[PDB]
Amino acid sequence: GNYDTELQALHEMVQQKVVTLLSDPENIVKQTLMENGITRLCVFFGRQKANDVLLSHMITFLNDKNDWHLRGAFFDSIVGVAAYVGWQSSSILKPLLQQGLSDAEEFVIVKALYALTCMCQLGLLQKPHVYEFASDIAPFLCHPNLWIRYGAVGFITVVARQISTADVYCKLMPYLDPYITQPIIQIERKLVLLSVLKEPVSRSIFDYALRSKDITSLFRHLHMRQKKRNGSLPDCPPPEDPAIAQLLKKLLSQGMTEEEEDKLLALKDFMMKSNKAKANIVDQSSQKGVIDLAALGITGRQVDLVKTTCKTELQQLIQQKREQCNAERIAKQMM
Amino acid sequence: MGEAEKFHYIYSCDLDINVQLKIGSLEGKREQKSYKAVLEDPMLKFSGLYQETCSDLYVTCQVFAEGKPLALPVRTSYKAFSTRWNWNEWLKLPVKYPDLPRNAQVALTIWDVYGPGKAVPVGGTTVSLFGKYGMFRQGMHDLKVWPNVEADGSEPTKTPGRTSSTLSEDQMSRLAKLTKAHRQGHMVKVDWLDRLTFREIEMINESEKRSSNFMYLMVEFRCVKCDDKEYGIVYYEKDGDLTSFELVK
Amino acid sequence: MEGKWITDQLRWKIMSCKMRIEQLKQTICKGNEEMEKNSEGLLKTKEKN
Amino acid sequence: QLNVTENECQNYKRCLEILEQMNEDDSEQLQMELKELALEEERLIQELED
Amino acid sequence: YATVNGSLVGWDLRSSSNAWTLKHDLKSGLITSFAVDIHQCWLCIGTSSGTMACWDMRFQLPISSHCHPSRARI
Amino acid sequence: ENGLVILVSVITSCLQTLKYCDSKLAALELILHLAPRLSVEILLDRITPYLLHFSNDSVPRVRAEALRTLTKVL
Amino acid sequence: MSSMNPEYDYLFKLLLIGDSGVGKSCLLLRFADDTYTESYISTIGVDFKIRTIELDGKTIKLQIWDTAGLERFRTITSSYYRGAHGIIVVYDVTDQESFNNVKQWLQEIDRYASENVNKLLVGNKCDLTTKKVVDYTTAKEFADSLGIPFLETSAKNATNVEQSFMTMAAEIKKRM
Ligand SMILES: Nc1nc2c(ncn2[C@@H]2O[C@H](COP(=O)(O)OP(=O)(O)OP(=O)(O)O)[C@@H](O)[C@H]2O)c(=O)[nH]1
């Protein structure tokens, strides 16, 4: 044989199937492929082919807005594909990673944050991007969701380990300062950072703000209240919109403290994007746990209870139902 | 006492829909570790065991058959819990009705946060998808959660959720089955007896809850209806439907 | 920053120590409460015996 | 690239000035406090053992 | 049938197995007689110490225990 | 291994006439257990051709297992 | 003509339902027995207190069933609703989850209960004003959207509770 002709035949055979799988009609097949072989396939397609063929296909998974598991699987496997495509893929993944940190399914944010942790740990993010992501992720350090909250710790701790101690104090510390209770230089220890985090936003406050339909007006009003605390505005006018008046009264009535108002503003970008994402899902939406057989067109077999190994177990089920039905009737009939 | 003169059933090979199981609520107390435990591993302080409210737990359900996973585990979406762990979420399992073997089991493991990026199991339970008579489970089922262990999919499971009658009959388990059998109308209702008997059950359950601190995770399986009749899925193989020869030696 | 690094090393120990001291105090408080519950139980059980 | 270098240079100039302007925290005072906290912990360890 | 050690056992003469088993509190006295409800929902055990203990047969649990004021044998 | 060449012949003579799904899976179990003990020539010549035959079986569970078996055997 | 009894001109089966820890037991104890306690025994199965009342000079014997609020004592079918004349759905004003599930209970009532059953949403734990998270208008829009009677009550700070049972009896009498 001729080695390049045979090797090229192998690449052609694997490339045809991988693309066949990444286009399967059942999302579970895509997810299964991502967990069982996405790293192996990158070696198979090659560095150049993997970005144009693989990454281009993997990016299409973030477009599935109905199945949050797939978007999660995207962030779980993108780490491996990106590792093979190389830093030349980072420009394509950068916009995608920012989209994950604002997913509709709170678990997708957990996976995306973890993905950013893994990607940063591997050095797959360019120097300017690492700082830019830290600025976008630092607000999560106060999120009420413990998975997200600890996920943020994971990102900040990985970032803190990746940059120089000088850059940690000169650049990393300024992004974290609004969310930390004490200035500790040993941010590189996971235990230290977890201990210095400010208390998260109250779930009632966070959930009530993210659930507010007028999140723009709420944040606009909140920005006026923050400007009052910052001295930029002498007096904050009461909310012009009664919907914001109701919300501001409710948030204060629910225990919104000045620290919780500051935390909400730090999380503003995340909360604003997430709200829009949740609205996009609602716009697309047998919700009853009941499966309708008429809708499936399946003809069931029926046996009256009044009077092969699978056939034997079936006969046992029929015997049990027949006996149980008569027994229940007898008890009522006896009364 | 209810009635049903006809049993409507369908072969599991004939139901071409995904099997869905709703992980409902987990009722019970998760015990906190001693301070010495927090001294041994300081990360324990940041674990979900130290959140005062019900931590936002999720259950990953993976179907196993003969000890091999049939599909990837499916996880409940993140939900914030206040006073009770109540998911009320219908999970779409990655297994179809025709693809489940007769010895198929669903392993549900409840996980909690254990520091940054690390999940530790709260407890696991495994329930067979087909009953002792090959009928797929129906209705609401309360599965005993084994603390500090992942749900085990080997056959027989080391973390069984439905303790069969062959083992030590847990008075709580027997009474729980009886309370449910009563609720559905499968037991004769005696008004005067019920007030006293159920009050006795309440005392037993209260006493058992104090000594057996085990958590029980509720899982509900979907029911199939056609023309208002409920159909049961029974394990059946697609191909389920001369010893002496005069010439052929 | 070499100096600041040394100071922050002390600050981590201090915050950890305060947490450890507080956790120790909380554990001791629980232990005394349990010993009290066991003592109350012991008295009732001694009477029961 | 030139602007990025100037911004990083400015940040280092500012950071050096900030570290130089931050009053030198008394290393000895913190060390004395740490010795006191260690004694309290040792006391709590004996008390916890008791 | 009820035994001296307080065991009330129902032997199913069809399958030779014990259909149900109840354990009476001997503190309530020796079992002297018992009655089973016509509706078969419950059974009541009378004792030598005058205690009348009520048992629910549907759930197979002892529900209530009452003693005669005179404590006379049933 | 000299004896195993003859043993493989008994299984392989049956794989084409299996009727039950229980048997089809069992046939695959035999191949999986015997595969690590056969010579490479026997694996590629006498075992490999039958797994691809099973991959066209009417039982989806069998088609999946055929792929699992073929993957492990190879 | 038919046989009737002087002890009650009408007998109304009431029925308390609602998630765990909402206050279903304490409502029953506060109405039937003017009783309260902080000690919680999770209701299992069924309970059946009695209070006899006179309304419009007609005599109504209320028979006010509790029900299980834990899920592990609960089933997709439920025969308890059968023959019920009134149904009382309860939530705890400090437990948003217990509030949200009210729609699920109305799904239960509509599947099993008598076709004309008088519902009545009762906001128990209304003594918890420090922790109220479902407020009057929030429930009243929902309750009025169904046309079900509504009240807020505390079995701890009893007085609201009385009107809850009086309301149920009234709405039953209007049907009877
Ligand atoms: N503050 C306050 N607490 C109440 C009130 N009513 C009930 N509770 C508390 O909630 C507990 C349970 O009341 P239940 O009636 O048993 O609630 P439930 O829905 O029946 O709970 P289950 O019986 O398990 O179904 C009581 O023991 C009290 O602790 C109330 O009106 N105010």
Swiss-Prot record, chain A:
Protein's recorded name: Phosphoinositide 3-kinase regulatory subunit 4
Subunit structure: Component of the PI3K (PI3KC3/PI3K-III/class III phosphatidylinositol 3-kinase) complex the core of which is composed of the catalytic subunit PIK3C3, the regulatory subunit PIK3R4 and BECN1 associating with additional regulatory/auxiliary subunits to form alternative complex forms. Alternative complex forms containing a fourth regulatory subunit in a mutually exclusive manner are PI3K complex I (PI3KC3-C1) containing ATG14, and PI3K complex II (PI3KC3-C2) containing UVRAG.
HEAT repeat intervals: 49-87
Cellular localization per UniProt: Late endosome; Cytoplasmic vesicle, Autophagosome; Membrane
UniProt record similarity statement: Belongs to the protein kinase superfamily. Ser/Thr protein kinase family.
Organism (species): Homo sapiens
PTM info: Myristoylated.
Domain of life assignment: Eukaryota
Signal peptide interval: none
Role summary: Regulatory subunit of the PI3K complex that mediates formation of phosphatidylinositol 3-phosphate; different complex forms are believed to play a role in multiple membrane trafficking pathways: PI3KC3-C1 is involved in initiation of autophagosomes and PI3KC3-C2 in maturation of autophagosomes and endocytosis. Involved in regulation of degradative endocytic trafficking and cytokinesis, probably in the context of PI3KC3-C2.
Shown chain mapped onto the complete sequence: 524 to 965 of 1358
Tissues expressing this chain: Ubiquitously expressed.
Phosphoserine modified-residue sites: S285
From Swiss-Prot, chain B:
Localization (cell): Midbody; Late endosome; Cytoplasmic vesicle, Autophagosome
Annotated positions of the Phosphothreonine modification: T163
Biased composition (Polar residues): 156-170
Tissue/organ expression: Ubiquitously expressed, with a highest expression in skeletal muscle.
Post-translational modification (record): Ubiquitinated via 'Lys-29'- and 'Lys-48'-linked ubiquitination by UBE3C, promoting its degradation. Deubiquitination by ZRANB1/TRABID promotes its stabilization, leading to autophagosome maturation.
Residues annotated as domain C2 PI3K-type: 35-184
Modified residues (Phosphoserine): S165
Region of interest called Disordered, as start-end residue ranges on this chain: 149-170
Subunit comment: Component of the PI3K (PI3KC3/PI3K-III/class III phosphatidylinositol 3-kinase) complex the core of which is composed of the catalytic subunit PIK3C3, the regulatory subunit PIK3R4 and BECN1 associating with additional regulatory/auxiliary subunits to form alternative complex forms. Alternative complex forms containing a fourth regulatory subunit in a mutually exclusive manner are: the PI3K complex I (PI3KC3-C1) containing ATG14, and the PI3K complex II (PI3KC3-C2) containing UVRAG.
UniProt record similarity statement: Belongs to the PI3/PI4-kinase family.
Official protein name in the record: Phosphatidylinositol 3-kinase catalytic subunit type 3
Coverage span on the entire protein: 1 to 254 of 887
UniProtKB/Swiss-Prot annotation, chain D:
Subcellular location: Mitochondrion; Nucleus; Cytoplasm
Protein name per Swiss-Prot or TrEMBL: Beclin-1-C 35 kDa
Organism field: Homo sapiens
Curated annotation (Swiss-Prot), chain G:
Post-translational modification: Phosphorylated by CDK1 kinase during mitosis. (Microbial infection) Phosphocholinated at Ser-79 by L.pneumophila AnkX, leading to displace GDP dissociation inhibitors (GDI). Both GDP-bound and GTP-bound forms can be phosphocholinated. Dephosphocholinated by L.pneumophila Lem3, restoring accessibility to L.pneumophila GTPase effector LepB.
Modification N-acetylserine occurs at: S2
Keyword Transmembrane: no
Gene3D superfamilies in the record: P-loop containing nucleotide triphosphate hydrolases (3.40.50.300)
EC code: 3.6.5.2
Catalytic activity: GTP + H2O = GDP + phosphate + H(+)
Needed cofactors: Mg(2+)
Effect of K61R: Promotes TLRs trafficking and TLRs-mediated signaling
Binding site for GTP: S20, G21, G23, K24, S25, C26, E38, T43, G69, N124, K125, D127, A155, K156
BP GO annotations: autophagosome assembly; autophagy; cell migration; COPII-coated vesicle cargo loading; defense response to bacterium; endocytosis; endoplasmic reticulum to Golgi vesicle-mediated transport; Golgi organization
Sequence positions bearing (Microbial infection) O-(2-cholinephosphoryl)serine: S79
Site of covalent link Glycyl lysine isopeptide (Lys-Gly) (interchain with G-Cter in ubiquitin): K49, K61
Binding annotation for Mg(2+): S25, T43, D66
Record's subcellular location: Golgi apparatus; Endoplasmic reticulum; Early endosome; Cytoplasm, Cytosol
Family from the record: Belongs to the small GTPase superfamily. Rab family.
NCBIfam families: small_GTP (TIGR00231)
Subunit architecture: May interact with YIPF5. Interacts with C9orf72; the interaction mediates recruitment of RAB1A to the ATG1/ULK1 kinase complex. Interacts with GDI1; this promotes dissociation from membranes. (Microbial infection) Interacts with L.pneumophila AnkX.
Protein's name according to its UniProt entry: Ras-related protein Rab-1A
